[PDB]
């Protein structure tokens, strides 16, 4: 199944990596600049960069692990909620309410589309079509993903779709026959 997340310590680890990334990026902006700049203008003329890094890190991993622990399953919806929280933190530097809402919903939609494709930049190996069973089944078996058959079982049709609209467990013809 799944096992519950360490929201405490993953959020501490995320705050550590965000602090380090803010240190590195503030040093990078210091070195790549003009004007009178010294060693302690790294945190005064930084442009608020450590706040960006740490706030995004705490917000995303807190909301991700909390949503995965509240829903008790793991899919791309947790990436949607965590990206909504990250967009909230990135949109609060904009001191404006409609832009804040735009940052929230659009970053959450982009991160949910990210987390729905697998939440991986790279590939999954066995989930690929190259490294999976493909083509026809050669004789009758549970049809996997990436596989094609000629006929499907009708019990699978009734269980997956339903028993409602035009769909029935026995066809209309043989349900109405003379004997």
């Amino acid at each position: 199944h799944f096992h519950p997340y360490n929201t405490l310590g993953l959020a501490t680890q995320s705050a550590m990596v965000g602090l380090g990334a803010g240190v590195v990026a503030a040093a990078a902006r210091n070195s790549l600049a003009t004007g009178p700049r010294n060693i302690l203008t790294t945190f005064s003329k930084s442009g608020g960069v450590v706040t960006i890094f740490t706030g995004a890190s705490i917000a995303y991993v807190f909301t991700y692990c909390s949503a995965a622990n509240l829903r008790e399953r793991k899919d791309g919806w947790n990436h949607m909620w965590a990206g909504a929280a990250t967009g909230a933190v990135l949109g609060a530097r904009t001191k404006l309410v409609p832009a804040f809402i735009g940052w929230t919903v659009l970053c959450g939609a982009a991160c949910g589309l990210f987390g729905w494709t697998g939440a991986r930049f790279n590939a999954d190996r066995k989930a690929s079509l190259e490294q999976s069973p493909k083509g026809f089944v050669q004789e009758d078996a549970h049809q996997t993903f990436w596989e094609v058959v000629h006929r499907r079982p009708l019990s699978l049709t009734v269980e997956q779709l339903g028993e409602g609209r035009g769909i029935n467990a026995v066809p209309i013809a043989t349900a109405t026959e003379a004997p």
Binding site: N30, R37, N38, I39
Partner: protein, 89 residues
């Protein structure tokens, strides 16, 4: 005479710091020639006596000569290592 390699390692560090912080552009280039000599010392030290003289012949005797020859008859401005310039780095 055990710590010879350690000594060449340390002296090479010190020579690079004197390369990147030097008044005059050719004071910096003479420190580079000294670093070539420290290299050839390390190469004889490890067991490659052939290569050390190949370094002294090719790198010192041709590349450094070309480099010094360039610095002589061309004009190159230089700021020196101000602390105002480089502790932002």
């Amino acid at each position: 005479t055990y710590y010879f390699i350690e000594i060449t390692i340390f002296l090479a560090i010190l020579c690079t710091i004197f390369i990147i912080s030097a008044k005059n552009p050719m004071v910096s280039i003479l420190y580079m020639i000294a670093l070539f000599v420290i290299a050839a010392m390390y190469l004889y030290l490890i067991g490659l006596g052939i290569f050390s003289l190949l370094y002294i012949m090719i790198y010192i005797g041709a590349i450094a000569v070309l480099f010094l020859f360039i610095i002589t008859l061309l004009d190159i401005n230089s700021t020196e290592l101000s602390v105002k310039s480089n502790i932002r780095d």
